[PDB]
């Protein structure tokens, strides 16, 4: 198509209290052998992962979009997965389209992705039908994630909810806790494990060790987001250290 772009600019629309995605996204993508990235954030305030915390956070969408658009990123990621999925089946399409339209009214060419939509995208690239989930959420929010994915055609075999409503606390969840949850799952005939549905719960270093342990593909909201960003930018998905999903273009 056109001239090689140089540094690829990624926009991140993130909960104010989130520290994990701005850490994990650069760490994961820094291992791309053929592309360089920069990361630019806008904050929507949230510290409590509850219906009301998420509603208050989502209401800042229009503000955040105008802010990050000013940076002319190539793709913009709506980072919080449950923020979208709490709105019920189909919500990522409504949110993504609302962002695209707002960007278009301001003359921006930026692409739009969301963690929720990216998870679907990653699960489908994996040819996954039966899926198991680990989440830091309170149970009712976990159940909405489950219902969302069922509507997209997935069978959710089993899931865990750590019930950690405070987002700062979510960021401090140790890998041992996450691994203990993943190990409590029944994984028989599960095609893929979502080791973290939330972008605040750390999981990146567990992805490789968990694939070796469980013998299935392992992804998170963050690795799904990375996959989606790569696909949106027409870049090869061949990044080491981030599970099978990030090596889909290995043979290429």
Curated annotation (Swiss-Prot):
<feature type="binding site">
    <location>
        <position position="137"/>
    </location>
    <ligand>
        <name>substrate</name>
    </ligand>
</feature>
<comment type="subunit">
    <text>Homodimer.</text>
</comment>
<feature type="binding site">
    <location>
        <begin position="80"/>
        <end position="82"/>
    </location>
    <ligand>
        <name>substrate</name>
    </ligand>
</feature>
<feature type="active site" description="Proton donor">
    <location>
        <position position="198"/>
    </location>
</feature>
<feature type="modified residue" description="S-(2-succinyl)cysteine">
    <location>
        <position position="80"/>
    </location>
</feature>
<feature type="active site" description="Nucleophile">
    <location>
        <position position="80"/>
    </location>
</feature>
<dbReference type="InterPro" id="IPR053714">
    <property type="entry name" value="Iso_Racemase_Enz_sf"/>
</dbReference>
<keyword id="KW-0413">Isomerase</keyword>
<feature type="binding site">
    <location>
        <position position="167"/>
    </location>
    <ligand>
        <name>substrate</name>
    </ligand>
</feature>
<dbReference type="GO" id="GO:0050076">
    <property type="term" value="F:maleate isomerase activity"/>
</dbReference>
<comment type="function">
    <text>Catalyzes cis-trans isomerization of the C2-C3 double bond in maleate to yield fumarate. Shows a strict specificity for maleate, with no activity detected toward structurally related substrates including citraconate, mesaconate, dimethylmaleate, and maleamide.</text>
</comment>
<dbReference type="Pfam" id="PF17645">
    <property type="entry name" value="Amdase"/>
</dbReference>
<dbReference type="InterPro" id="IPR028615">
    <property type="entry name" value="Maleate_isomerase"/>
</dbReference>
<comment type="similarity">
    <text>Belongs to the maleate isomerase family.</text>
</comment>
<feature type="binding site">
    <location>
        <begin position="199"/>
        <end position="200"/>
    </location>
    <ligand>
        <name>substrate</name>
    </ligand>
</feature>
<protein>
    <recommendedName>
        <fullName>Maleate isomerase</fullName>
        <ecNumber>5.2.1.1</ecNumber>
    </recommendedName>
</protein>
<dbReference type="InterPro" id="IPR026286">
    <property type="entry name" value="MaiA/AMDase"/>
</dbReference>
<feature type="binding site">
    <location>
        <position position="18"/>
    </location>
    <ligand>
        <name>substrate</name>
    </ligand>
</feature>
């Amino acid at each position: 198509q056109g001239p090689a772009m140089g540094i690829r600019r990624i926009g991140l629309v993130v909960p104010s209290s989130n520290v994990t995605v701005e850490t994990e996204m650069p760490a994961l993508l820094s291992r791309h052998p053929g592309a360089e990235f920069s990361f630019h954030s806008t904050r929507m305030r949230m510290h409590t992962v509850s219906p009301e915390g998420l509603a208050a956070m989502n209401a800042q969408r229009e503000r955040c979009v105008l802010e990050i658009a000013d940076a002319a990123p190539e793709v913009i990621l709506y980072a919080c997965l449950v923020a979208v999925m709490v709105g019920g089946p189909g919500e990522h399409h409504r949110v993504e389209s609302a962002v695209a339209e707002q960007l278009a009214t301001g003359g921006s060419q930026a692409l739009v992705r969301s963690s929720a939509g990216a998870l679907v995208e990653g699960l489908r690239a994996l040819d996954a039908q039966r899926v198991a989930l680990v989440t830091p959420y309170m149970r009712p929010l976990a159940e909405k994630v489950v219902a969302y994915l069922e509507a997209e055609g997935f069978t959710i075999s089993d899931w865990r909810a750590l019930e950690v409503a405070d987002n700062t606390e979510v960021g401090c969840i140790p890998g041992e806790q996450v691994m203990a949850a993943a190990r409590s799952l029944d994984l028989s005939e599960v095609d893929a494990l979502v080791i973290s549905c939330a972008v605040q719960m750390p999981s990146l270093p567990l992805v490789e060790t968990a694939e070796r342990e469980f013998g299935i593909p392992v992804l998170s909201a963050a690795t799904a987001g990375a996959y989606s960003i790569l696909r949106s930018l027409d870049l090869p998905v061949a990044v080491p250290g981030a599970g099978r999903l990030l090596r889909q273009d290995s043979a290429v």
